[PDB]
Amino acid sequence: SEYRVDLVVLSEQKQNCRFGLTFHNLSDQDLNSWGLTFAFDRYILPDSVSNGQLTQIGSFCTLKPEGIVLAANHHYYCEFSIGSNPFRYYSDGFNEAMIDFVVDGQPQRAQVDVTPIVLASPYRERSDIPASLTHAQPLLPKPNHIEVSDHSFTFDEQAGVAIYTDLANSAKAWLLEELQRIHQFTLSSSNSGKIIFKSNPTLDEGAYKLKVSEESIKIEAGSSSGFTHACATLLQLLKRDEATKTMEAVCCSIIDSPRFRYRGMMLDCARHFHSVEQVKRLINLLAHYKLNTFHWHLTDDEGWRVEIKSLPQLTEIGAWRGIDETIEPQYTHLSQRYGGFYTQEEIRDVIAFAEQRGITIIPEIDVPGHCRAAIKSLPHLLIEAEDTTEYRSIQHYNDNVINPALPGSYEFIDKVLEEIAALFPAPYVHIGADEVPNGVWSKSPACQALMEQLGYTDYKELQGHFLRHAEDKLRKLGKRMLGWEEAQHGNKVSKDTVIYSWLSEEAALNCARQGFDVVLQPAQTTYLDMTQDYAPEEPGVDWANPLPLEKAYNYEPLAEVPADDPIRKRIWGIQTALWCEIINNPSRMDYMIFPRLTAMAEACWTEKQHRDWTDYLSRLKGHLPLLDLQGVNYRKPWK
């Protein structure tokens, strides 16, 4: 390109970084009435900008220069600062840049080459995974009881699969589907088959037995999920022999059951849209590691991804962003129209696909904050034009909070929650309920009136009025409300609202003892957007620290909470999350999720006493070839 932008660290002190920004006109003609636009995921301090006017809306930054012309071969220099500690990674720099300009009274655009940032203080350390042997049974998660014998069962495509209970129907169909998809091994269902599915009603939900004899395999379970898990194990246990068209399983006795009931994964689809094809692909992979819940985060400030038939603007407007759209670009795709949404038909198809693998889908509708896409889609319904309140969200927005005095806000939430409740069969809806920015609604006339009506003195308490409505609406719709961390404080919600705790384990147990059911999703150990290593080339974010494989594996949930403790009745289980601020490609998503998803899965399933880092590594090492057969772009632990 003819245009280039170089960003450099000029100074690093306690909670302050200063940068030099040089823009280079390397074209042969002058730039007239020009402006620099770029994406940057840190809040630039407004007082800091030394030579031009900066506006910032989220990641979308625009720098208007003082001078009206930048001559050919000339340079424009600007300094700015951020409130942060040193950058350790190249992704902390500008993701993208472009210029707007005028040649002969006509508006023009051009992409700018962004030079990688010159870091001052990259990490010197590196996470090193020791050399590992290859475990003969590469099982992830580790079964709680496995006893291996000296012989093996070798079978061809006519071995046959027998089924003596309808509870095993979906598991059986999934096993055959996967053996076809992965290995091209076609097993047929036979009444006299060598692979047997048998009912055993003494076994608990999710539990199974799996015994490989010399000339047969017997799977026992008392639940549909039981049979599904046995089939996930069996997929990992089988070794295909390419010389023949045969499969081999080691003779062994497996008795297994889940440590936790809720074993989930959250995917952020609002930040970047991931196709139906990638969601299905990911959902199937979750079932390989015995997870049972897909938490679909479908809305946020940067996008609305779920078709609401009664409010079609939420997708027609809210699902798209860019320069020529209502919603400004964010993170990536600075110059393109970026977006997409899931149709209700697509969502039904994903739901049906997920239940074939024992996966429940929990939809999330973020309110009253994290609501910019909604608000920008429905301004006549959601904007109070007379509201002058100056506030700032954590993602540095001043216009992203639903107004709880406007009747349109209740028309919005009711219509959305009605269609979500009918579409999603799971008896749970996640409502977001992040704490709103401080002093929000304080200079809203409509809210002043509602405060007087309800007799509240503090404006914070209106979010509890809004959330109580959402909760009661969902109750009438046969749904139980779910919320994030901060929903527990104040009287915001009832004790039937399930809390997804990300602060700490100590805090989650605090929340549990107040009466709430809780899901553990601690940001320090389960956020797969975090970098996997200290090298500055590594993709990801680091705000909650880098999350190397070993750190991920050392997450031992409820380690000091005794086996028979009454508080464990309130722990639903564990969740791991993928936030997608900087994840827009399937390739990059595979990279962040794998191999750490397997460590998370093992924390969810395997009892603490059967967990071991060395043993895990050997099982992961033997599992890597199976991920290659499926073309999963995992991060190689040994490179």
* Cα distance between residue 67 and residue 292, in whole Å: 59
* Cα distance between residue 344 and residue 456, in whole Å: 40
CA-to-CA separations, 42 to 6, 92, 463, 577, in angstroms, rounded = 17, 8, 27, 21
* Cα distance between residue 183 and residue 399, in whole Å: 52
Phi-psi domain of 420 (left: phi exceeds 0; alpha: psi -120 through 50; beta: other): alpha
* Residues 254 and 301 both lie in one domain: no
Binding-site residue numbers for N-acetyl-D-glucosamine are 271, 529, 543, 581
- Reported structure resolution in angstroms: 2.4
Name residues whose C-beta falls within 8 Å of residue 235's C-beta, 6 or more positions apart in sequence.
175, 178, 179, 182, 288, 626
> Looking at 210, 225, 258, which one is the last position of a domain?
258
CA-to-CA separations, 76 to 26, 71, 97, 110, in angstroms, rounded = 12, 10, 15, 17
* Residues 375 and 455 both lie in one domain: yes
* Residues 109 and 133 both lie in one domain: no
Question: In a 3-state reduction of DSSP, which class is residue 299?
Answer: strand
* Residues 65 and 212 both lie in one domain: no
Tell me, letter by letter, the H, E, C secondary structure of 211-264.
Answer: EECCCCEEEEECCHHHHHHHHHHHHHHCEEECCCCEEEEEEEEEEECCCCCEEE
> Looking at 243, 258, 273, which one is the last position of a domain?
258
CA-to-CA separations, 424 to 196, 364, 416, 500, in angstroms, rounded = 33, 11, 12, 19
User: Long-range contact list for 628-631, CB < 8 A, 24+ apart?
Assistant: 629/182, 629/183, 630/182
Both tokens assigned to 119: 């870091």
CA-to-CA separations, 486 to 188, 380, 436, in angstroms, rounded = 51, 30, 10
Q: 7: exposed, middle or buried (C-beta count within 10 Å: 0-12, 13-18, 19+)?
A: buried
Q: Provide the domain limits for residue 210.
A: 128-258
Catalytic: which of 355, 411, 435, 461?
Answer: 435
* Residues 50 and 188 both lie in one domain: no
Nearest to 433 by CA among 388, 377, 381, 491: 491
Both tokens assigned to 289: 């590691």
CA-to-CA separations, 66 to 5, 24, 31, 52, 108, in angstroms, rounded = 17, 16, 13, 5, 19
* Residues 237 and 98 both lie in one domain: no
* Cα distance between residue 153 and residue 238, in whole Å: 10
Q: What letter does residue 180 receive in the DSSP assignment?
A: I
* Residues 227 and 277 both lie in one domain: no
* Residues 623 and 505 both lie in one domain: yes
* Residues 79 and 145 both lie in one domain: no
* Residues 320 and 456 both lie in one domain: yes
* Residues 242 and 287 both lie in one domain: no
Residues 371 and 393 sit within 8 Å (Cβ to Cβ): no
* Residues 95 and 132 both lie in one domain: no
CATH code at 506?
3.20.20.80
Say how many domains are in the chain: 3
> Looking at 127, 156, 189, which one is the last position of a domain?
127
Active site residue 461: no
Buried b (16+ CB within 10 A) or exposed e, 391-404: bebebebeebbbbb
CA-to-CA separations, 137 to 211, 416, 470, 593, 610, in angstroms, rounded = 14, 47, 48, 22, 15
Residues 3 and 99 sit within 8 Å (Cβ to Cβ): yes
252 - beta bridge partners? 148, 212
* Cα distance between residue 590 and residue 612, in whole Å: 25
Residue type, 303: G
